[PDB]
Amino acid sequence: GQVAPNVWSKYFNIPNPGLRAYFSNVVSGQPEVYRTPFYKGMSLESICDEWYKKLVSIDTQWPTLMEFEDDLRKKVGPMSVMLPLKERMSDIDSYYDSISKDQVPFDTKAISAAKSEWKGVSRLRLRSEVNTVAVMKKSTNSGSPYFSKRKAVVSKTIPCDVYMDGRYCVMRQNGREWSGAAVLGWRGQEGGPKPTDVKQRVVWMFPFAVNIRELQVYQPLILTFQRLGLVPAWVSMEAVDRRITKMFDTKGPRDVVVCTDFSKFDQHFNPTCQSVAKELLADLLTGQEAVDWLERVFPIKYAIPLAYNWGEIRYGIHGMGSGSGGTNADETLVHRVLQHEAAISHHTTLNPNSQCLGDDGVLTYPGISAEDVMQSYSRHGLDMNLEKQYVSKQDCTYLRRWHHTDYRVDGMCVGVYSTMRALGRLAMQERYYDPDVWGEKMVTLRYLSIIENVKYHPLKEEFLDFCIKGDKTRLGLGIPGFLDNIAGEAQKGIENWWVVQALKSRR
């Protein structure tokens, strides 16, 4: 994969000490387990064991909630252990090798069914690069070529034009021509109590110029879908819960709900899947600028080179570059086609209160079974382990929340987040920040964002009292002014969070 130094400098603005440090850390990895101050002096097991003594009280009335909690308890553990590059090469290979599995075309009727859900919608037009940049996150890394904060390089980036030229990504940026490459990034996810259990997620950190061009379509798309409520997970967890409720209200009395799961969905998002995304987008879009975007920009996330070490670049087509501006959009649109196709393949109609988001789905239709869904999806070159599908007539899991037809608050099947998963995240963090340089307010803000997830758990009040006891600052109760100025401290919808209201009530 190695390129000459004066070829590397056509992909990145050189010199760049920050980029140099970055790839050194990629090569070395980060072996330390980062433990927060939460219940300092106690192990993760002891924290979990102590809370479990009280959690277990729900097993009699909500035994499937206990099963859900027990399941996620097995994943509790470190999140910070990042393996060296030498031990992640298979993770990279997967993106290139997984798209060539046997893959059959999609049913044309299912594609029509998906399009029909947005009949009459205002067709999308590209936003301008300037307007798009204005609403983007500009704290994030600009990727190739400057590898700085976006905010710092806007004037050097736009106007921009990006396109594939054979295996190369050409990026014209305000008078410069660069060669584009994603940068290999990393995220850790808990997968068990040992340091070797940490899930090694690959992140494709895209060039700012590519993300701008992509978001000229995906930004207005997501906004339109949000306002129409077509993808509830893009709106809120309360919108998700409302649709879960309707799914239970309108499902076949004899039918199960199926909660699906994909192995390495991004990696398997092959050219057959890509062409379906392109067809749906072409339906949604209007204008000549859109025609050009579909031919020039849309394919980049499936073909952009990958810079995985200093001076090392990999080329060729691959699955979804996890990190594209359309990562979630392309996948969610195509996932909805998959759901329609499963129903249509069994001579019926998808219950439209079924839902999907990226690789996560929950659905029902007359006579549905998990193995039928698995067969209907997998024939397109997608990987699924039947053992990880979940089936029930009375409950479901979606976006790591449990719902039950008999567990309703003001008539909604609200989503219950695992307190066990919450405890693991309170105790373990993905990245180290020195609190001498960064402060304890940010620790507390992280705690609150985790705890807020359990706002519908039957034991949330006991859980909060348990968490308060683990925090020196008592979740901000011990930080003068903090709770009263929490939106502000957050900047330096949180004021409306349940956990904030619950803490203030304990004053």
Author numbering: 1 to 492, 520 to 534
From the manuscript:
Human PBV (hPBV) has been identified on almost every continent, and has been associated with acute gastroenteritis primarily in children and people that are immunocompromised. It has a bi-segmented genome with the genome segment two (PBV2) encoding the viral RdRP and the genome segment one (PBV1) encoding the CP and a protein of unknown function. The hPBV RdRP possesses a canonical polymerase fold with a 24 amino acids (aa) long C-terminal insertion loop structure that partially occupies the active site of the polymerase.
The ΔLOOP RdRP was crystallized and its structure solved by molecular replacement using the WT RdRP structure as the phasing model. The overall structure of ΔLOOP appears to be essentially the same as the WT RdRP (root-mean-square deviation in distance = 0.4 Å for 3275 common atoms), except for the deleted insertion loop which became unstructured in the ΔLOOP RdRP. Given this structural information, we are confident that the removal of the insertion loop should not affect the overall folding of the polymerase, and that the ΔLOOP RdRP should provide an excellent tool to study the function of the insertion loop structure using in vitro assays. This result indicates that back-priming was taking place during dsRNA synthesis by the ΔLOOP RdRP, thus producing a product that was covalently linked to the ssRNA template.
